[PDB]
Amino acid sequence: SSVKISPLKDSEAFQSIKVGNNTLQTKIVYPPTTRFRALEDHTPSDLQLQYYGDRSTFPGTLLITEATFVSPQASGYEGAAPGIWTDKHAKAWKVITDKVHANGSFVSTQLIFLGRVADPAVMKTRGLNPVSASATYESDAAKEAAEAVGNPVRALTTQEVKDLVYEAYTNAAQKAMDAGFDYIELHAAHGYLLDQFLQPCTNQRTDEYGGSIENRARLILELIDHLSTIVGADKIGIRISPWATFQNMKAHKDTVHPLTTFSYLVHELQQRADKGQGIAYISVVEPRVSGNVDVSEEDQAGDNEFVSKIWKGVILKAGNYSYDAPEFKTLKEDIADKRTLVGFSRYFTSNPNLVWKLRDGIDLVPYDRNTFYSDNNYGYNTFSMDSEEVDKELEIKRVPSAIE
Amino acid sequence: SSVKISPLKDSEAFQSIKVGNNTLQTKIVYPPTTRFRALEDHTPSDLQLQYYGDRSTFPGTLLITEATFVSPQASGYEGAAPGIWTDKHAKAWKVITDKVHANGSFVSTQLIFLGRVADPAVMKTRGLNPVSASATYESDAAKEAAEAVGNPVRALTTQEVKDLVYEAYTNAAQKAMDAGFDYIELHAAHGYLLDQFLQPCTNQRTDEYGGSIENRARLILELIDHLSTIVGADKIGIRISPWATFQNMKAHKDTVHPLTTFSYLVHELQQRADKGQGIAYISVVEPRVSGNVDVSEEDQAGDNEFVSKIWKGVILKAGNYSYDAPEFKTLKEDIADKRTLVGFSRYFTSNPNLVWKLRDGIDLVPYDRNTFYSDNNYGYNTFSMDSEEVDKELEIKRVPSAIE
Numbered sequence: 127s128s129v130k131i132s133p134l135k136d137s138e139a140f141q142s143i144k145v146g147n148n149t150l151q152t153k154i155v156y157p158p159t160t161r162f163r164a165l166e167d168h169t170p171s172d173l174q175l176q177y178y179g180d181r182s183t184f185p186g187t188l189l190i191t192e193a194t195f196v197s198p199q200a201s202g203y204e205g206a207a208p209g210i211w212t213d214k215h216a217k218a219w220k221v222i223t224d225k226v227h228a229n230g231s232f233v234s235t236q237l238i239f240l241g242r243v244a245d246p247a248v249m250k251t252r253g254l255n256p257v258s259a260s261a262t263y264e265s266d267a268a269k270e271a272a273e274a275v276g277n278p279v280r281a282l283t284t285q286e287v288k289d290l291v292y293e294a295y296t297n298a299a300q301k302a303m304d305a306g307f308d309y310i311e312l313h314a315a316h317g318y319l320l321d322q323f324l325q326p327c328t329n330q331r332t333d334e335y336g337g338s339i340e341n342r343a344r345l346i347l348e349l350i351d352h353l354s355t356i357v358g359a360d361k362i363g364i365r366i367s368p369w370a371t372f373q374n375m376k377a378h379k380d381t382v383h384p385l386t387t388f389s390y391l392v393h394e395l396q397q398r399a400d401k402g403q404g405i406a407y408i409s410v411v412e413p414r415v416s417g418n419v420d421v422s423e424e425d426q427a428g429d430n431e432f433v434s435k436i437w438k439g440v441i442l443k444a445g446n447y448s449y450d451a452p453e454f455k456t457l458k459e460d461i462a463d464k465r466t467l468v469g470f471s472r473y474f475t476s477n478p479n480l481v482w483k484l485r486d487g488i489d490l491v492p493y494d495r496n497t498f499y500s501d502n503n504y505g506y507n508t509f510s511m512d513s514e515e516v517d518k519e520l521e522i523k524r525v526p527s528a529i530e
Numbered sequence: 531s532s533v534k535i536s537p538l539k540d541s542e543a544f545q546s547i548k549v550g551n552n553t554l555q556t557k558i559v560y561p562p563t564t565r566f567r568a569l570e571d572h573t574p575s576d577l578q579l580q581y582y583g584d585r586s587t588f589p590g591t592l593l594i595t596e597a598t599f600v601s602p603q604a605s606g607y608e609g610a611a612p613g614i615w616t617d618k619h620a621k622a623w624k625v626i627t628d629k630v631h632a633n634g635s636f637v638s639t640q641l642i643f644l645g646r647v648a649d650p651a652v653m654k655t656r657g658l659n660p661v662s663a664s665a666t667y668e669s670d671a672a673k674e675a676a677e678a679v680g681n682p683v684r685a686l687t688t689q690e691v692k693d694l695v696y697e698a699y700t701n702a703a704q705k706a707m708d709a710g711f712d713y714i715e716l717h718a719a720h721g722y723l724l725d726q727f728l729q730p731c732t733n734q735r736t737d738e739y740g741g742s743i744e745n746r747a748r749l750i751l752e753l754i755d756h757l758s759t760i761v762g763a764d765k766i767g768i769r770i771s772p773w774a775t776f777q778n779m780k781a782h783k784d785t786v787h788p789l790t791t792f793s794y795l796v797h798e799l800q801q802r803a804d805k806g807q808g809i810a811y812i813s814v815v816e817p818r819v820s821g822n823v824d825v826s827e828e829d830q831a832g833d834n835e836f837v838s839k840i841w842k843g844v845i846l847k848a849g850n851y852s853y854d855a856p857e858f859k860t861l862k863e864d865i866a867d868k869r870t871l872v873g874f875s876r877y878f879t880s881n882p883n884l885v886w887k888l889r890d891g892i893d894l895v896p897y898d899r900n901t902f903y904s905d906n907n908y909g910y911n912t913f914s915m916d917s918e919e920v921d922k923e924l925e926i927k928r929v930p931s932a933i934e
């Protein structure tokens with residue numbers, strides 16, 4: 127069903143805001159949204175070039191790219207997700223950032239590392255193991271799958287964790303700059319590698335990177351500090367999902383509560399800001415959503431108020447913000463402090479002109495979950511076409527191709 | 531009467547375009563429009579700050595400031611026009627350019643020098659004469675006015691012309707950069723100083739700055755070349771009005787036809803572009819308008835086709851573009867080559883959101899000639915208010931005040 131909405135034109139959503147070194151002209155953001163339309167070698171494709179281009183047309187919009195692998199060890203999906211570790215990746219991404227910039231908009235790349243959830247057969251083909259802070263599995267099924275192919279999850283050694291900072295993320299950051307990205311965003315949410323380090327259910331290390339709240343945060347803060355010296359703190363973001371149970375994170379049922387874990391991290395970030403090394407933004411997932419799953423009010427165990435209390439800089443919030451449309455009471459409350467951005471991910475898939483629709487109160491086109499993760503153009507770039515012109519069968523067969 | 535118009539949203543008017551180092555997101559421009567709401571010392575005012583701010587809200591719009599004096603000798607209006615020759619001027623303008631930039635828009639300052647039309651009593655109070663390329667007057671009345679106060683027009687000496695390049699315009703350019711302007715625009719139109727140099731009715735010099743087509747253009751090209759080394763060619767524009775008879779320019783009735791004079795100048799500009807020193811844009815007044823006066827098709831003696839044929843860079847055209855509204859056939863033809871901007875001046879006075887109105891086909895508010903040149907806020911910033919709230923008598927008494 128089309129979502130009826132009232133116009134946000136005269137609201138804070140269309141007041142400018144400085145984020146790092148750049149000024150956005152709308153507070154509506156496209157959050158990182160995995161779609162699997164990259165090329166098989168992980169280079170961004172012709173489809174992605176149009177896709178991000180189509181969403182950049184309100185000048186001064188921030189778009190954040192779908193999770194992008196920092197390195198071969200960072201991968202582990204069967205579908206084709208993009209990567210930012212080779213010159214080829216960077217050159218292809220550059221065509222996309224150029225297009226976004228030509229519309230006066232900005233783009234952040236989300237850097238992901240799968241960790242314990244990497245598909246063990248996929249990793250085997252690279253001669254790699256699934257790796258994590260500790261040797262744990264999301265489920266007994268995951269454990270079975272890995273041991274079946276003789277490719278069990280293993281804990282990174284101390285030196286490998288150092289390598290993550292000085293090699294894997296450093297190179298990804300350098301490539302992201304070659305590719306013209308305005309920001310890099312550390313993916314510390316949804317039970318992927320950095321989240322695995324942060325929380326105790328997934329990190330039982332006995333070196334400097336585990337064994338306490340402070341040690342578990344150490345890798346993340348070392349990345350923030352090191353990358354700040356490489357690209358500048360103004361080009362760095364980080365995403366967290368304190369309440370999510372996606373990919374079997376314990377969350378509030380863990381031995382350390384997310385309020386403790388994440389308040390520690392956010393306060394350390396603010397202390398860096400106080401010293402003139404404030405990162406560009408902290409992106410947080412609202413408790414209405416866990417990964418890609420909606421959460422009932424009854425199941426919600428907390429909220430993100432603590433982030434606003436502790437961190438004085440820009441905050442990006444996302445998670446079913448249209449739940450109280452058409453009036454958007456929650457959205458308006460959340461952006462009232464003038465330093466908060468609001469993201470829409472699912473509705474941006476089916477509404478490439480979402481910023482324009484929200485501005486002028488145009489009904490939203492419903493999204494199509496069936497085509498979120500498929501491998502072709504149908505339900506991807508087709509939302510930018512007039513229905514009468516979409517040749518469905520042709521588009522289902524249109525797989526990603528090289529740019530140009 | 532409100533002008534009925536069709537939406538330009540899907541037209542070239544909303545395709546991006548690179549102008550110098552910056553990219554505009556609309557081809558609709560606010561051309562330089564004198565309004566006399568500066569402070570008495572010529573520092574920009576609180577009223578001007580809001581006025582330009584109000585017109586910058588479509589992100590990526592180019593605004594061009596009202597003619598701004600390069601120096602004390604450049605002045606000569608009774609009304610209060612702004613200047614860019616002191617630190618105070620620059621600091622005040624900076625608040626205005628900051629505001630425009632915070633909306634993602636850009637601003638060019640038009641640098642004017644009045645010359646033979648400077649009010650002789652005003653110039654007397656500065657201890658200065660009206661000056662020009664040659665000692666000529668716009669009319670017998672102008673001659674009478676000047677001789678009456680014992681302050682006749684005089685020809686600049688050769689050294690004074692050099693001073694214009696190395697001192698007057700150089701300092702204005704440096705201040706414009708201090709003030710954060712994206713471009714400086716040489717005013718070579720409408721019978722002011724640079725136009726007085728270009729055309730033979732106003733320039734009968736016998737030094738290197740007159741006596742031939744090439745010598746008459748020499749000062750203008752020396753300014754282009756010298757300022758290009760100071761601020762970079764990408765930050766320079768120039769405005770010409772080949773067909774105008776404003777302030778008694780002979781135009782087509784002169785001993786050298788404007789097609790000759792202005793084709794010479796534009797071709798010299800293109801030759802600089804060919805060598806990598808191409809200026810940002812050439813602004814031309816369409817033959818529908820002469821200064822502030824509409825011209826009948828019957829009286830029009832030529833057109834600006836030659837500029838498009840000779841110059842390969844960005845062109846800004848202005849002059850009663852709504853004459854064939856609501857369809858805008860002429861506007862669409864003129865921007866079809868993808869390197870042409872179109873300006874609206876009179877309708878931008880009464881429609882601060884003009885870009886938005888044109889985008890979505892909203893009827894235009896009629897402009898009010900009676901308040902074009904008055905000294906107070908009524909009919910100036912009042913167009914941004916809802917009529918029901920305008921206290922007319924209060925606004926008529928609201929004269930310009932210092933910013934902040």
Ligand SMILES: Cc1cc2nc3c(=O)[nH]c(=O)nc-3n(C[C@H](O)[C@H](O)[C@H](O)COP(=O)(O)O)c2cc1C
Pocket residue numbers: 157158159160161192193236313315316365411415417418444445446447469470471472473498499
């Ligand atoms: C298809 C899909 C792909 C997603 N991919 C990512 C991702 O790559 N990185 C990420 O941090 N979140 C991802 N998310 C979570 C979303 O960014 C977003 O936080 C969530 O969908 C809630 O926002 P919404 O209600 O506006 O969709 C994804 C969600 C969906 C539905």
Ligand SMILES: Cc1cc2nc3c(=O)[nH]c(=O)nc-3n(C[C@H](O)[C@H](O)[C@H](O)COP(=O)(O)O)c2cc1C
Pocket residue numbers: 561562563564565596597640717719720769815819821822848849850851873874875876877902903
């Ligand atoms: C009140 C007024 C002030 C103007 N001031 C300037 C100026 O300072 N410099 C300039 O080059 N042209 C000036 N012009 C000419 C306009 O920029 C424009 O070229 C002309 O008005 C035709 O455009 P329009 O039909 O959209 O008004 C002015 C015109 C008007 C009506």
Ligand SMILES: NC(=O)c1cccnc1
Pocket residue numbers: 160193238315316417418
């Ligand atoms: N990378 C992510 O955080 C992600 C991907 C797909 C669905 N939900 C979350």
Ligand SMILES: NC(=O)c1cccnc1
Pocket residue numbers: 564597642719720821822
């Ligand atoms: N400066 C100008 O070119 C100008 C000023 C007022 C009216 N018309 C033209």
Ligand code: NA
Pocket residue numbers: 183228229230544545546555
């Ligand atoms: Na655009």
Ligand code: NA
Pocket residue numbers: 243
């Ligand atoms: Na999985």
Ligand code: NA
Pocket residue numbers: 315316317321367368369370371372375
């Ligand atoms: Na989580």
Ligand code: NA
Pocket residue numbers: 434459460461462463466
């Ligand atoms: Na808030």
Ligand code: NA
Pocket residue numbers: 140141142151587632633634
């Ligand atoms: Na704005």
Ligand code: NA
Pocket residue numbers: 647
């Ligand atoms: Na006069």
Ligand code: NA
Pocket residue numbers: 719720721725771772773774775776779
């Ligand atoms: Na003229």
Ligand code: NA
Pocket residue numbers: 838863864865866867870
């Ligand atoms: Na043209």
